[PDB]
């Protein structure tokens, strides 16, 4: 079964470079171009280029001429995308993709996506602050403030409270750190938000109380 596996997420500082890889299995690797597309947070799709693994020939979007290099390693069925002189807008999920025609159907195959975070910030766990209720139903939550990089997870009551929960998409503050709020509704008649930040190993259960 055709599969394309991408390298793991990365954080880079402005001006650095990143080399994302895309390993192909399940088909003849030298017969089909590998295409790279990116999507910045909340935006659309932008095309970077393709490389033909048969001959190593390339074509790039002019918007990246001089910053992007695409190479192949046929022996291990891997295509690479190296983006140099990284800037803040370069923050996006990067996808590799190919398209084949077996049987008689054209089929498309995609990687799982590689998050490239360009930021002068450094890894930091979040500080969790309670959002206590203030007098038929009550609302409460947690303010997960000042963490880097993404992502942070929030659960309530160790996973028992899934109903009426709204965890908001994170916002990037001018300080380069992320923050999101997570809220829940409960009748006016305990409650603990479980916050975990894998990049900093920060795990904080905070009980909310009025």
């Amino acid at each position: 079964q055709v599969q394309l596996v991408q390298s793991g997420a990365e954080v880079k500082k402005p001006g650095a470079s990143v080399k994302v890889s895309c390993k192909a299995s399940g088909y003849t690797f030298t017969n089909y171009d590998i295409n790279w597309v990116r999507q910045a947070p909340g935006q659309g799709l932008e095309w970077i280029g393709w490389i033909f693994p048969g001959e190593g020939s390339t074509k790039y979007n002019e918007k990246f001429k001089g910053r992007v290099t695409m190479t192949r390693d046929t022996s291990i069925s891997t295509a690479y995308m190296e983006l140099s002189r990284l800037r803040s807008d370069d923050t996006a999920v990067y996808y590799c993709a190919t398209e084949l025609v077996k049987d008689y159907y054209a089929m498309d195959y995609w990687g799982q996506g590689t998050l490239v975070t360009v930021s002068s910030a450094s890894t930091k766990g979040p500080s969790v602050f309670p959002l206590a209720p203030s007098s038929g139903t009550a609302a409460l939550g947690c303010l997960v403030k000042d963490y880097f990089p993404e992502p942070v997870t929030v659960s309530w009551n160790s996973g028992a409270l899934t109903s009426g929960v709204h965890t908001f998409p994170a916002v990037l503050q001018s300080s380069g750190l992320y923050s999101l709020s997570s809220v829940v509704t409960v009748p006016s008649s305990t409650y603990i938000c479980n916050v975990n930040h894998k990049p900093s190993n920060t795990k904080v259960d905070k009980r909310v109380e009025p």
Partner: protein, 212 residues
């Protein structure tokens, strides 16, 4: 570059509705147009190539049409797993270019936002910062507006907002507008209020408190 322009950027429909979505190229591109579907947090799934030919596994209710500069994607009977964003793309000339998305959302009855207000926590004031949060829970449609006031001085900047996706059980939206200021500036003012305006409300609604 060839510009691909999609319209509308969003649309509210219902299951069974017949949805039509357009895509226009700044130059004639023959039949070399593709359509993609994408779910949030997932890679795109290719739907159409050569303007009208479906990819493997793409249900027949997805049909493509067009030639030259005007193109169309048609969903004959909208099914619940079809709510997603849809991109067209040309590949007649380089660089390959996409249009912006056409997000396809669930229509439902108007809902007024339940407005709540939270003060900065003491754990946060001991830390030296101040974060006040205005919550807008369960409303429809997505469009809304929140405005802050400290001692009835209208606030500009140092306030950011985040809107969740359509709830899986009631298709409603929720918003969090977060206003952030110095502990010094927070103590220096008395009453705080956030004004919420939403077409499901007959007049502006305001929740407020007094500390600092």
């Amino acid at each position: 570059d060839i510009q691909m322009t999609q319209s509308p950027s969003s649309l509210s429909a219902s299951v069974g509705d017949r949805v039509t979505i357009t895509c226009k190229a700044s130059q004639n591109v023959g039949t070399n147009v593709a359509w993609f579907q994408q779910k949030p947090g997932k890679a795109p799934k290719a739907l159409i190539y050569s303007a009208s030919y479906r990819y493997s596994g793409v249900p027949s209710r997805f049909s493509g049409s067009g030639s030259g500069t005007d193109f169309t994607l048609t969903i004959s009977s909208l099914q619940p797993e079809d709510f997603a964003t849809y991109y067209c793309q040309q590949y007649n000339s380089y660089p390959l270019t996409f249009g912006q998305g056409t997000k396809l959302e669930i229509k439902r009855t108007v809902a007024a936002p339940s407005v709540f207000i939270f003060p900065p926590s003491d754990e946060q004031l001991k830390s030296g910062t101040a974060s006040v949060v205005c919550l807008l829970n369960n409303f429809y449609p997505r469009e809304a507006k929140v405005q802050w006031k400290v001692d009835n001085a209208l606030q500009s900047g140092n306030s950011q907002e985040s809107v969740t996706e359509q709830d899986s059980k009631d298709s409603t939206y929720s918003l969090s507008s977060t206003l952030t200021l110095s502990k010094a500036d927070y103590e220096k003012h008395k009453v705080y209020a956030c004004e919420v305006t939403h077409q499901g409300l007959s007049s502006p609604v305001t929740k407020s408190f007094n500390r600092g």
